[PDB]
Design an enzyme around this catalytic site. Sequence first.
Site, short mmCIF file in Angstrom:
data_model
loop_
_atom_site.label_atom_id
_atom_site.label_comp_id
_atom_site.label_asym_id
_atom_site.label_seq_id
_atom_site.Cartn_x
_atom_site.Cartn_y
_atom_site.Cartn_z
N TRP A 140 -78.80 23.99 -63.46
CA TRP A 140 -78.11 22.76 -63.11
C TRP A 140 -79.22 21.71 -63.22
O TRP A 140 -80.28 21.83 -62.59
CB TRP A 140 -77.58 22.87 -61.67
CG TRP A 140 -76.88 21.66 -61.15
CD1 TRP A 140 -75.96 20.91 -61.80
CD2 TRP A 140 -77.02 21.11 -59.85
NE1 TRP A 140 -75.50 19.91 -60.98
CE2 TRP A 140 -76.14 20.01 -59.77
CE3 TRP A 140 -77.80 21.43 -58.73
CZ2 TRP A 140 -76.01 19.24 -58.61
CZ3 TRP A 140 -77.67 20.66 -57.58
CH2 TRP A 140 -76.78 19.58 -57.53
N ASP A 157 -80.02 29.46 -54.25
CA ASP A 157 -79.08 28.37 -54.29
C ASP A 157 -77.75 29.13 -54.39
O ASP A 157 -77.45 29.76 -55.41
CB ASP A 157 -79.32 27.49 -55.51
CG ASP A 157 -78.35 26.34 -55.58
OD1 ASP A 157 -77.59 26.14 -54.62
OD2 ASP A 157 -78.32 25.63 -56.59
N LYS A 159 -67.08 23.97 -53.21
CA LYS A 159 -66.14 24.68 -54.08
C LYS A 159 -65.22 25.65 -53.36
O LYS A 159 -64.00 25.55 -53.48
CB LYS A 159 -66.87 25.43 -55.19
CG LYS A 159 -67.17 24.62 -56.43
CD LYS A 159 -68.27 23.58 -56.20
CE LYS A 159 -69.59 24.21 -55.76
NZ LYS A 159 -70.67 23.20 -55.52
C1 LIG Z 1 -76.00 25.58 -58.84
C2 LIG Z 1 -75.42 24.44 -58.03
N1 LIG Z 1 -76.11 24.32 -56.85
C3 LIG Z 1 -75.81 23.37 -55.93
C4 LIG Z 1 -74.77 22.52 -56.20
C5 LIG Z 1 -74.57 21.52 -55.05
O1 LIG Z 1 -73.31 20.99 -54.86
P1 LIG Z 1 -72.86 20.22 -53.55
O2 LIG Z 1 -74.06 19.41 -53.15
O3 LIG Z 1 -71.79 19.29 -54.03
O4 LIG Z 1 -72.69 21.09 -52.43
C6 LIG Z 1 -73.96 22.52 -57.39
C7 LIG Z 1 -72.80 21.56 -57.68
N2 LIG Z 1 -72.75 21.55 -59.20
C8 LIG Z 1 -71.58 20.73 -59.67
C9 LIG Z 1 -71.68 19.33 -59.09
C10 LIG Z 1 -71.55 20.71 -61.22
O5 LIG Z 1 -72.20 21.79 -61.75
O6 LIG Z 1 -70.98 19.78 -61.95
C11 LIG Z 1 -74.35 23.53 -58.28
O7 LIG Z 1 -73.78 23.79 -59.48
#
Ligand SMILES: Cc1ncc(COP(=O)(O)O)c(CN[C@@H](C)C(=O)O)c1O
Lengths: 396, 396
Positions: free
Chosen positions: B130, B211, B246
């Site tokens: 990410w 994570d 999610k």
């Molecule tokens: C691997 C991963 N870690 C942490 C987060 C943290 O999300 P929140 O802070 O909203 O709890 C996301 C959200 N990924 C989304 C936003 C995306 O891949 O578009 C993610 O994909």
Amino acid sequence: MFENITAAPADPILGLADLFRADERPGKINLGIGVYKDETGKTPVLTSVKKAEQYLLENETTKNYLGIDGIPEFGRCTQELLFGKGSALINDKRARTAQTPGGTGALRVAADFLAKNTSVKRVWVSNPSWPNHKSVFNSAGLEVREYAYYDAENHTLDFDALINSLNEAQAGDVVLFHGCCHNPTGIDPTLEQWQTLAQLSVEKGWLPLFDFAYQGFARGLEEDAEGLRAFAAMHKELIVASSYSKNFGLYNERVGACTLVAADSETVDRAFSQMKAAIRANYSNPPAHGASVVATILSNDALRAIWEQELTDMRQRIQRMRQLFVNTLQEKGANRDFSFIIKQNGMFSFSGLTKEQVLRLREEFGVYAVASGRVNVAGMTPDNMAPLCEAIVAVL
Amino acid sequence: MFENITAAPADPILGLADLFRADERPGKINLGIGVYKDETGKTPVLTSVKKAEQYLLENETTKNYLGIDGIPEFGRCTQELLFGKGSALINDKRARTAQTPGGTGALRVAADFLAKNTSVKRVWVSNPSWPNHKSVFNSAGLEVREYAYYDAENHTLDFDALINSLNEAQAGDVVLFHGCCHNPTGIDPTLEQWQTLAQLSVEKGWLPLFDFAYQGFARGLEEDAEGLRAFAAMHKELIVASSYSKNFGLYNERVGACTLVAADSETVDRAFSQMKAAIRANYSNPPAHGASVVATILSNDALRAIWEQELTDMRQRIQRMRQLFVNTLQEKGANRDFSFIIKQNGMFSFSGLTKEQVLRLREEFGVYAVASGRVNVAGMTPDNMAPLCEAIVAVL
Ligand SMILES: Cc1ncc(COP(=O)(O)O)c(CN[C@@H](C)C(=O)O)c1O
Ligand SMILES: Cc1ncc(COP(=O)(O)O)c(CN[C@@H](C)C(=O)O)c1O
């Protein structure tokens, strides 16, 4: 990796909470709260917000992410609240607001943006101030310098020592001002003082950073914004961090804002993008709930009308407690003079008690106060006033 | 001060949103969302959370501040969710959880704590990952190194290149692992691979940082925690950042957690105090709403039962879309083989499309995808599947 980690120091305000909630004494009073309380000794949720929450529960169809800068209506509404309904800053679109996790969160984002996108490294904070101000700026890697403010003897704003202190500050330095209801003294500059402060600021090239956490608790919504509005019409740039924790009783929903003002739209937009990048690397986007509540209330007059009345009720209660305080003290007899208490705005003020006095007050009478002698007027009620003043008189 | 500020770069994922919402084309599809969507193309609020929200509206008597670490029940509940109901880490009380503003907020607090209370300065992230992972760690002042992971040709986990990459990592370095549903590949290590990874981690002296943002989206709540549980029983220390965005559809309420595990209670407590200090200097305390919703649902079985069913429905829909996808492609005829899609977990996966192909897809057919070819399966419906697969076949 954590086997040799040092334990963090106890927060001067937070630590006192636990000692209070351990003192099994009958008739104990806690004046080191930092939160508003009504005549019953409770922090209720406003009726207007309860109404706004019902509306949301029925209307929300999604919990999908907000933009990095939060809800648009919230932003527009805070700007009108801060700079005035027909403000030039709004029409020229020189301002940009980001919804943030409370006022503290607004200060941290301002700190990170500043520390990474500009030449600033010194931030001037008053002495005294809210203890967390230093920690926030330091964590961003910024240096914290203090300017004179309080006058221990007269219990007033030492305007001269103030001006004298700010002189050693240079152009490009950030100077932090409390919008109204100065924490912990409750001493605020008069409009004339704000005005000379605004002129000196423009000459020296300071970057004003307003911490506005108690709008509506000194004199009124608009009146309390006079200082900020004085600088606003004088400056090309400034930053204002605001909180809705107190005036909306939304403490734990973390609702606040960070308003960025630049010479013009083109430049404010370019700088805002970097502020959004700072947010994205922190918490991604802001919590909708508390902000949703504020936006619906402020954009509906049935609701906004109720809210304003609830705020004046809060403001008036604090003002009545400061008066009842001076009277009850001056009534239970003791050589002193707490008239200055009536001259100060907001929930806090320095009682003018010594370290020992506040320690003896706690240990011997169960009256709790921040070691600095900071006292929360909203923690006083017509019921606890007498024993409170009796204990104070007994330690003079 | 802001007159020469450089405009921030457009976010690879976020920027695509605006171009989509501008493309006036009839029959456009957006697969670069990153959020769950149902058969209707909407992100509804779960019925269980709607029920939990009614309960709160009727029961809350105050909005007074939460502790720096949030609500206790929320913490206990997340720990049982992560490490198992009868886990030794829980009974020996070696873990401490802080409620935070989403998963991103959990990573930033872990980053700040680490950067200020330890000797760490390198964080190993997979390639790819990410995009925001780098930015979060960099803002904390930590260095970001990448280890091999994906296998462009076979569309699988290149375990050897992975191990080979981690070898250049030193003791005291942090290694970041996605708990399940790897973003953006959807390729996750098997339990046996997690186990060798846990042993190698213990030998080399890595500090694991999990994570965990999609618990319940690969195979189930417990199944998805096998990897983390493998490291947990193997390590004396580790950090896990989790999100409920999610699995609870609570995206904009910013609900997540940062769990800190140390060799023992005495040491974990000492390290946690410094983690609370990092939070205090950031946003002060966390937003109650979303966390309140999660704590009440998980602590009531009527509610928890409904929630679990709603989660399996979500999980199963994604799995059906991956299948429908492979079939419909393999049906609309084209030399290829998208069988790997069925082997991958979660909402994302690499379609295996070239930069040009995704650009042509967008420009010529209105199909939107992240330039990297990352596609969100939950953005596909039985309705848009055919034209979607037709467009893909037309660019092969
Ligand atoms: C691997 C991963 N870690 C942490 C987060 C943290 O999300 P929140 O802070 O909203 O709890 C996301 C959200 N990924 C989304 C936003 C995306 O891949 O578009 C993610 O994909
Ligand atoms: C001057 C001042 N600025 C900002 C804040 C930020 O508050 P929120 O982040 O909760 O919006 C506070 C809260 N001061 C309280 C906590 C006290 O003085 O005890 C404050 O006093």
